Design a protein around this nucleic acid. Structure first.
Ligand SMILES: Nc1ncnc2c1ncn2[C@@H]1O[C@H](COP(=O)(O)OP(=O)(O)O)[C@@H](O)[C@H]1O
Ligand SMILES: [Mg+2]
Ligand SMILES: [Zn+2]
Lengths: 173, 645, 200, 195, 193
DNA sequence: CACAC
DNA sequence: GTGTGTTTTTTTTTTTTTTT
């Protein structure tokens, strides 16, 4: 959560569904009505970095609604088959946003689910990372699994696979 | 068989844990009992229960894993447990002297998340045999519904006793058992003659359909692959060819694969198929919703509120194809077609069709095909056709032979499948003349007739026809009358409600606006996509299987589809004298008009006016037609004919 | 909303991050995106003008604390986010420039058109600072030397680019092209770094 | 930056080799540096003790730092002695011990893999055992330890971990993955425990 | 025949465990990596096997249809040894070969070369759908209910249900396939031009 | 497969 | 009692090809 983390910066600017609590005047600069105000009980999508502050200061101005990524459907999908889930399709920065949402809401069950998902997928990505192709003179499963990773999983995978490749190169040099 | 009883008891404990299934069973039983106690009634509820896999996983992960890994040893115990539970809480009414003999096993159905078991016919590898899988596809072939014996009842007219003999097949029961020779025992063990007691014997409806993957996820250079599914009991006739569907069932294997001294070295494989347990009819090409889209009360209220908008017609027309610049009146006509006027089923065999058929002919690269593609992507029931890529036999009805039974049968064509739907025909001028008479008969009387191969039938295709056409020359010649510019008979043109002429005249301001709009369209970037990144498609959005004032410029396409469905279902407009005066006045003025000399205006134009007025009344959700409907219909027809405004 | 420019800028920044991350291609920085910088600067200036406008209009007018506080706070948070995006992009460029300077201090001092004037001056002074650190107290050791352990002392090398004759510490090296030396790895590290000798 | 990204928190295998190069090992000097009672320059180093080097006697085993022994082994002026764990019997006993206890690692010296690689590369002819068998047994031990590591990975908790008796190279190669997964699991728990 | 089969299997197991060019057991590493990604197969290069021992290559080339299943069994045993701690249910691995022999023209295939090893070229013109061939076949005796299992090599010699009860007579065809317990693999038919 | 040759 | 023998199909519908 460092200030200059590029992944954190990208994750901050993600729209989230959230209704309003006041008929606040003069807002909507790019929300389809620059001069016209924003009405009470209005459901709009707002960037997470701004919605975070707007959800605490106030009764808070904005009531955050549960996003589609953390709906009970996705929860059931995660609890069913963590390995065969294309989490990249759900979002490129799913784990960071899960961490931020849990930190804001102290929602322990989501944290318990996401930790299990992370462990189960870490097992498989380590299996793939330590698998090094050797030329007798890019496996199909490797690539078809790599597309279902967020940037952090793609980063841990790159680092671990680089370490494995360096070890193999030094060992057999 | 101790494991069987253990699974039965754990399943019953799970059922008691979630009483919602018990309530559903109670509702089904009381509904059936009330219908039996109540007449021209035939709607009886089935003995099937839909459970969510998520609840089973939360309760007992071992049982859920056994279900999803080796269902042949876990679902039969669950069915036994459900039957025992149903009997225990059954209202124990007076027996019919048949239900005691006619068994009624309570089928199981599943929904929710499936993970890696959500597959397609192409990806259904042999490793998934004996494993419960969910496969999406299109219904293409459907065998005839054929009942089969599972239990025969016999009466001994020397002892007054009833003997039952249960019949099992590899395609009926999941667990493998010795096949029964399907012979009725006419004699008792003690030399007593037995009479087969039909009605007390038990037969089940059986069907065998073919499910093939999407053509659009079919990989480059490969044709779609297909699998065979065996729907049984309730699931028969629940689907028809051309339906998108997701089936949940066991991937079973059958056959001998040689291995019988008939084929020792011959390398033939085994028969593989699916015993369907659940059918979910995803449709409308939205990948996750059915054609009969569910309407929430909020959506209905919003639809009613938007119906009070003055120019809701224009808003919906413009919201149809935002990426297609201009062609506003064409969009209005398309919206009228999608949700058309009333069909008059008059007496004495008279029939006035309510569908609107429009032929639009125009210059090349004028979005003629793109409009039809959009209508295909939007309409609830839309079938694509190409004039070159179509045969009349493959368009209306094909005389094939059945394989399950081995005898002749008819298969629906392109328009019969589109009954109550829309047919989008591109390259209409390129259609074969010999098969063009068939579509002429369709658009004339909405029915086809077959009198070949000892089959004399009349099928109903009450579809709405939209056609895209090109001029006889490479481009339209305005110096020539609109008869030689079209290579189609005027009788064929007559049945069309509207004929739209599209001219690609080279303007400068209009050309600039078109170019700017097209560039805005081409520079669009999908939300979850980066610049310079190929737009890959997976469409694995089935994370769970099954059901699991205001003045906006443009409404969302699914919301528009919901509005169209609600309007088609609910409002049945009535033509009004105030509309009658306007309609008759406009028809008279157009008929005896000097500029209308080149027009084919006849009595059919009056039918077109009535249909347009009814469709416009449907647009306003008014249960009766009004003057504004007639005025708008007259203006649109006058635009279609003359084009001045 | 308002952070779209910063969002595109940080997306490009991460793109450059993966670009330089792959192997060790030692590519020059992508051209300074002065366009996005100027656009977001104009956005920030307009939002600052809006803040001043709201302040003066609240002073002259009768605006309750609710709207005056809320719009001003939202705009301030908008500047916070945009400034953070700019800071992240500039920090990425600074760190990659640091990498180029540290690795190439003994290699080469170079297309500078991809960098802004501030970045060019930063690199020019940072080379001076690195040299000052090398010559200050830790001059006995070479701070810019190779970070790989000196596993072997004597190695063989082949001349890639003929440099005629170059005086080494004690003798002299006749860097005839397509000729192979077998000498100490210690006194030829800089030449190999520059790209004159190839074999290990 | 001053430190390249791939060297941020882990050691490159070359660094592990360099670290292991400072371990003392027993060798047979092929020269005799013992200046008799009846000039020459002593090693007089500062990273190690020169006393043994200045007093080497031909074919009399001494103990010196590993990398000096390798430098001498560049010529035929020395000879490396394999440690007692580099015998076929000890390797077989360790194999049996590993196969006997599936949940605990063998008690090998922490630098066994790198030492084996270095000795095989540069001292391939100083073993009483067939080198083609030693290589196979070393590879078998590496595979068995990998299999054990993978099974021990299925219990990655969020508090701590005990990798007992594990070697150095395996730890170095597994550091970037385990130390990063453990960080994310700790962060999730801490975010949950924000009350 | 069992002694010869064990001899060949042990020889191939030794070849897998020992073959290496320079300090790297190439086949061991390849097998481990393939197991890591659930790829139960192995690409064996022909020159490597030839260089290891010419006798093994000659025995393979004489009767490949009988030698290859033993090689697959040895591969499975090696996989169990070096991928699972002793003290199952692992499918039999599929062997893949690579060679540099002279490519025989397609029309040059004749009455000879039968049951030999042939290398050739062509262009694919037809790819049928995937059928299923059984490898593990649970089978049930019809009358006395004596259940057993059968293992199929899928390498046709030049197999059917047993023609006896094998423990009352139960008939000459007393066996029925137990589909829910058997194991199958995918098979595809191609047409080369 | 099974009843008839 | 060992081993057989059926039931079992070439329509209608596409696509090509030569005349016309
Ligand atoms: N009015 C229009 N607005 C936007 N695009 C258009 C328009 N007219 C034509 N096009 C473009 O022309 C292309 C080809 O159109 P097409 O459907 O082939 O027309 P036709 O069937 O008349 O040849 C389409 O990609 C479409 O984007
Ligand atoms: Mg077109
Ligand atoms: Zn028997």
């Amino acid at each position: 959560m460092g200030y200059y983390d590029i992944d954190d910066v990208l994750a901050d600017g993600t729209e989230f569904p959230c209704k309003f609590q006041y008929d606040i005047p003069g807002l909507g600069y790019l929300e389809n009505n620059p001069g016209r105000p924003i009405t009470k009980n209005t459901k709009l999508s707002l960037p997470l970095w701004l919605a975070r502050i707007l959800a605490i200061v106030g009764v808070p101005f904005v009531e955050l609604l549960p996003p589609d990524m953390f709906s009970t459907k996705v929860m059931n999908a995660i609890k069913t088959d963590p390995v065969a889930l294309d989490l990249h399709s759900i979002n490129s920065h799913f784990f960071s946003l899960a961490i931020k949402w849990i930190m804001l809401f102290s929602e322990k069950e989501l944290a318990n689910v996401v930790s299990e998902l992370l462990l189960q997928r870490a097992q498989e990505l380590n299996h793939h990372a330590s698998s090094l192709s050797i030329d007798l003179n890019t496996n199909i499963a490797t690539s078809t699994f790599l597309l279902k990773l967020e940037e952090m999983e793609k980063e841990i995978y790159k680092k671990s696979h680089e370490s494995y490749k360096d070890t193999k190169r030094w060992m057999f040099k | 068989d101790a494991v069987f009883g253990d699974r039965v008891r754990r399943f019953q404990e799970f059922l008691d844990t979630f009483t919602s299934y018990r309530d559903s069973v109670r509702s089904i039983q009381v509904y059936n009992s009330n219908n039996a106690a109540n007449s021209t009634s035939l709607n009886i509820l089935p003995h099937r229960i839909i459970i969510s896999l998520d609840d089973l996983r939360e309760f007992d992960r071992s049982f859920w894993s056994g279900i999803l890994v080796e269902p042949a040893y876990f679902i039969p115990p669950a069915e036994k447990a459900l039957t025992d539970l149903a009997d225990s809480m059954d209202d124990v009414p007076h027996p019919n002297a048949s239900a005691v003999s006619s068994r009624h096993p309570w089928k199981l159905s599943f929904k929710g998340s499936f993970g890696a078991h959500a597959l397609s016919p192409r990806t259904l590898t042999a490793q998934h045999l004996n494993k419960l899988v969910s496969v999406e596809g299109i219904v293409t072939k459907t065998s005839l519904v054929r009942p089969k014996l599972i239990r025969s009842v016999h009466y001994a007219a020397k002892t007054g006793r009833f003997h039952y003999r249960d019949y099992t097949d590899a395609t009926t029961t999941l667990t493998t058992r010795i096949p029964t020779p399907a012979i009725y025992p006419t004699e008792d063990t003690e030399g007593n003659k037995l009479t087969t007691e039909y009605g007390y014997s038990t037969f089940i409806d059986h069907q065998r359909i073919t499910v093939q993957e999407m053509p659009e996820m079919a990989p480059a250079g490969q044709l779609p692959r297909s699998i065979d599914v065996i729907l049984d009991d309730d699931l028969v006739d629940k689907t028809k060819p051309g339906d998108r569907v997701n089936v949940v069932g066991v991937f079973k294997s059958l056959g001998a694969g040689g291995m019988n001294q008939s084929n020792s070295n011959t390398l033939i494989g085994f028969k593989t198929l699916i015993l369907g347990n659940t059918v979910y009819p995803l449709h409308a090409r939205s990948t996750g919703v059915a054609a009969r889209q569910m309407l929430t009360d909020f959506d209905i209220r919003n639809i009613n509120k938007l119906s009070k908008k003055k120019d809701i017609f224009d808003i919906l027309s413009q919201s149809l194809a935002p990426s297609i610049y201009g062609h506003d009146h064409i969009k209005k006509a398309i919206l009228l077609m999608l949700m058309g006027g009333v069909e008059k089923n008059l007496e004495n065999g008279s029939h006035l069709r309510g569908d609107i058929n429009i032929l639009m002919v125009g210059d090349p690269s004028t979005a003629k095909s793109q409009l039809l593609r959009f209508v295909l992507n939007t309409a609830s029931l839309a079938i694509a056709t190409t004039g070159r890529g179509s045969s009349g036999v493959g368009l209306t009805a094909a005389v094939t032979t059945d394989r399950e039974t081995g005898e002749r049968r008819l298969e629906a064509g392109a328009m019969v499948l589109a009954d109550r739907g829309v047919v989008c025909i591109d390259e209409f001028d390129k259609m074969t003349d010999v098969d063009r008479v068939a579509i002429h008969e369709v658009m004339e009387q909405q029915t086809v007739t077959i009198a070949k191969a000892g089959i004399h039938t009349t099928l109903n295709a009450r579809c709405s026809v939209i056609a895209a056409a090109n001029p006889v020359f490479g481009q339209y010649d305005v110096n020539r009358d609109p008869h030689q510019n079209i290579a189609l008979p005027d009788s064929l043109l007559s049945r069309f409600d509207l004929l739209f002429v599209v001219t690609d005249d080279i303007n400068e301001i209009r050309d600039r606006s078109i170019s700017e709009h097209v560039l805005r369209t081409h520079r669009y970037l999908p939300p979850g996509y980066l610049e310079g990144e190929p737009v890959r498609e997976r469409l694995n959005l089935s994370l769970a299987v099954g059901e699991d004032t205001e003045i906006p410029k443009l409404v969302t396409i699914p919301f528009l589809r919901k509005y169209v469905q609600y309007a088609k279902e609910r409002v049945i407009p009535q033509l009004t004298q105030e509309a009658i005066n306007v309609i008759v006045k406009n028809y008279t003025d157009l008929r005896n008009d000097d500029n209308t000399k080149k027009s084919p205006i006849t009595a059919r134009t009056l039918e077109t006016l009535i249909r347009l007025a009814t469709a416009h009344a449907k647009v306003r959700l008014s249960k009766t037609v009004n003057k504004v409907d007639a005025k708008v219909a007259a203006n649109l027809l006058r635009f279609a004919l003359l084009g001045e405004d | 909303m308002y952070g779209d420019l910063g969002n595109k800028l940080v997306l490009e920044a991460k793109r450059t991050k993966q670009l330089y991350a792959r192997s060790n291609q030692d590519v020059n920085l992508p051209m300074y995106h002065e366009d996005i910088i100027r656009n977001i600067l104009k956005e920030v200036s307009n939002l600052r003008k809006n803040t001043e406008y709201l302040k003066e209009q609240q002073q002259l007018g009768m605006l309750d604390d609710k709207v005056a506080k809320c719009q001003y706070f939202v705009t301030l948070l908008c500047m916070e986010r945009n400034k953070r995006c700019l800071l992240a992009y500039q920090r990425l460029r600074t760190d990659i420039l640091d990498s180029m300077a540290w690795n190439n201090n003994g290699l080469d001092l170079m297309d500078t058109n991809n960098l802004s004037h501030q970045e060019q001056e930063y690199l020019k002074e940072y080379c001076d600072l690195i040299t000052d650190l090398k010559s200050g107290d830790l001059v006995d050791i070479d701070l810019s030397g190779s970070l790989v352990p000196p596993s072997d002392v004597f190695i063989d090398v082949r001349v890639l680019k003929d440099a005629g004759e170059i005086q080494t510490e004690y003798g002299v090296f006749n860097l005839i092209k397509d000729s192979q030396f077998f000498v100490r790895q210690s006194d030829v590290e800089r030449l190999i770094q520059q790209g004159y000798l190839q074999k290990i | 930056m001053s430190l390249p990204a791939h060297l941020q928190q882990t050691f490159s295998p070359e660094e592990i080799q360099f670290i292991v190069e400072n371990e003392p090992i027993k060798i047979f000097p092929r020269i005799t540096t013992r200046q008799k009672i009846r000039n020459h320059t002593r090693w007089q180093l500062i990273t190690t003790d020169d006393k043994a080097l200045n007093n080497m006697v031909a074919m009399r085993s001494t103990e010196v730092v590993l990398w000096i022994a390798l430098l001498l082994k560049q010529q035929s002026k020395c000879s490396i002695v394999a440690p007692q764990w580099l015998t076929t019997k000890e390797l077989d006993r360790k194999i049996q011990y590993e196969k006997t206890h599936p949940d605990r690692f063998s008690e090998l010296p922490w630098n066994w893999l790198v030492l084996a690689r270095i000795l095989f590369n540069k001292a391939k002819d100083d073993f009483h055992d067939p080198i083609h068998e030693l290589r196979g047994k070393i590879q078998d031990l590496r595979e068995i330890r990998q299999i054990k590591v993978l099974k021990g990975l299925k219990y990655l908790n969020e508090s701590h971990l005990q990798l007992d008796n594990l070697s150095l190279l395996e730890i170095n190669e597994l550091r970037p993955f385990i130390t990063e997964i453990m960080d994310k699991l700790r962060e999730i728990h801490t975010a949950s425990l924000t009350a | 025949n069992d002694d010869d089969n064990t001899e060949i299997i042990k020889s191939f197991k030794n070849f897998i465990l020992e073959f290496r060019l320079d300090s790297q057991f190439i086949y061991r590493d390849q097998l481990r990596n393939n197991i890591l990604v659930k790829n139960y197969s192995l690409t064996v290069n022909m020159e490597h096997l030839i260089g290891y021992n010419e006798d093994i290559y000659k025995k393979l080339s004489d009767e490949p249809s009988d030698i290859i299943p033993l090689f697959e069994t040895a591969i499975t045993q090696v996989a169990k040894r070096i991928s699972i701690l002793s003290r199952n249910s692992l499918p039999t691995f599929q062997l893949i070969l690579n060679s540099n022999a002279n490519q025989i023209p397609l029309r040059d295939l004749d009455s000879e070369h039968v049951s030999k090893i042939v290398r050739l070229s062509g262009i694919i013109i037809s790819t049928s759908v995937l059928s299923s061939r059984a490898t593990y076949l649970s089978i049930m005796c019809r009358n006395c209910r004596h259940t057993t299992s059968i293992t199929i090599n899928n390498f046709n010699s030049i197999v059917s249900l047993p023609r006896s009860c094998l423990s009352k007579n139960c008939g000459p065809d007393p066996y029925i396939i137990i589909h829910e317990s058997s194991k199958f693999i995918d098979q595809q038919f191609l047409k080369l031009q």
